[PDB]
Write a protein that binds this ligand. Structure first.
Ligand code: HEM
Ligand code: NA
Length: 396
């Protein structure tokens, strides 16, 4: 049970390029005890077949009642949400919003998502020197705007979320992440109270009435948990898809040129962005309900287990020539949105946002290029998140 590797000790080189580390683990076997840079001891599961199996394996629970790790008040306040639940709670909670997120319902959002991206790109192109940070200009504001509109988060409240997620992803120290959790929990409880009795038609207003009409269908703690998960999971990964995906495309001129020559390759290109540079480096916490033996390594009941999606996607038996970004590759079966009962409910909306943003950038910036050498980029060390601090670009 002591870790074999402290990922914090490896520093920024590991954050920027974690792949050799994970591949070395994979060659030793499927599961490994590590300490993360944040100080948590966890098991990593590596290798595509084992990763896909554990994601779908009901022996691995998502409910903190099966973890041996105790929670703070702030943590406990937010965890009654579907991603941190098992059936039957999972089943009930996801049913409450499944209809909002279907391919057909999401498709009705297209004109508004297009308007948002057109507006943000209009503002970017107005820059004096034909330079911007893609993160600040597009990748961050697009997804927070879309989820905020859907939920009903007023415009001046939205900037706080970048501060909070910065604190959850890359905390200066553990106290800072706890403070941000406490702040966010209080804000969401205020926002829920502010919708009650206001006859709003946004999704948070509907969820507040669902809870008030029957507390057995959605309890007040699950109402706060649902607001939390939809708002945070509903933008944070999309931001990094857009920036990671655009970094990949701009880093590979042959693929960029293939896309420009045939824009019907756009959906496959966004799938290979997910496969090659997806934002979820490792899935969210799983806890074995009983001891689980993975090819002779026994993970104790209750320990925290991270499924390393990033290493599954570089397993060459499953994705041949895995280090090549190839927008024409067969990407079907990637794990970037997970697999099994927790498979991302946001996938149609994430795809719609990322496809619209990538198309608008290529159409509106015919000479788009990176305005930064790779060595000036700064990546997050947390093995759960693959993402950049900034992505400077330039166009004609
Ligand atoms: C490119 C963007 C996205 C990626 C890569 C992504 C990835 C994932 C993954 C890997 C999981 C499952 C995690 C696990 O099993 O541990 C998941 C779950 C989830 N995602 Fe996404 N996501 C994205 C965008 C979105 C959006 C736009 C929404 C807004 C609805 C959203 C809402 C959720 C929620 C609520 C869950 C929990 C589902 C459940 O437990 O049944 N996600 N996402
Ligand atoms: Na990382």
């Amino acid at each position: 049970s002591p870790p074999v590797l402290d990922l914090g000790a490896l520093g920024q080189d590991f954050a920027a390029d974690p792949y050799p580390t994970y591949a070395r683990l994979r060659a030793e076997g499927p599961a490994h005890r590590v300490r993360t840079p944040e100080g948590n001891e966890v098991w990593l599961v590596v290798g595509y077949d084992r990763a896909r199996a554990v994601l779908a394996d009901p022996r691995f629970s998502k409910d903190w009642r099966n973890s041996t790790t105790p929670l703070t008040e702030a943590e406990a306040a937010l965890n009654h949400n579907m991603l941190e639940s098992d059936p039957p709670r999972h089943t009930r909670l996801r049913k409450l919003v499944a209809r909002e997120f279907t391919m057909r319902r999401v498709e009705l959002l297209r004109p508004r998502v297009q308007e948002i991206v057109d507006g943000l790109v209009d503002a970017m192109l107005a820059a004096p020197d034909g330079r911007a940070d893609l993160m600040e200009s597009l990748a961050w504001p697009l997804p927070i705007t879309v989820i905020s509109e859907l939920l009903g988060v007023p415009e001046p409240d939205r900037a706080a979320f970048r501060v909070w997620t910065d604190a959850f992803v890359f905390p200066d120290d553990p106290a800072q992440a706890q403070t941000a959790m406490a702040e966010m929990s209080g804000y969401l409880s205020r926002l829920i109270d502010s919708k009650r009795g206001q006859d709003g038609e946004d999704l948070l207003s509907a969820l507040v009435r669902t809870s008030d009409e029957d507390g057995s269908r959605l309890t007040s703690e699950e109402l706060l948990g649902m607001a939390h998960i939809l708002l945070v999971a509903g933008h944070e990964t999309t931001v990094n898809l857009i920036a990671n995906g655009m970094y990949a495309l701009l880093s590979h001129p042959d693929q960029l040129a293939a896309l420009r020559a045939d824009m019907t390759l756009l959906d496959g290109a966004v799938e290979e962005m997910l496969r090659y540079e997806g934002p979820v480096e490792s899935a969210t916490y799983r806890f074995p309900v009983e001891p689980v033996d993975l090819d002779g390594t026994v993970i104790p009941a209750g320990d925290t287990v991270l499924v390393v999606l990033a290493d599954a996607h570089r397993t060459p038996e499953r994705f041949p020539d895995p280090h090549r970004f190839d927008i024409r590759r067969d990407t079907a079966g990637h794990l970037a949105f997970g697999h099994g009962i927790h498979f991302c409910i946001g996938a149609p909306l994430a795809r719609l946002e990322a496809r619209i943003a990538v198309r608008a950038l290529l159409e509106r910036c015919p000479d788009l290029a990176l305005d930064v050498s790779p060595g000036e980029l700064v990546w997050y060390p947390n093995p759960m998140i693959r993402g950049l601090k900034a992505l400077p670009i330039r166009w004609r």
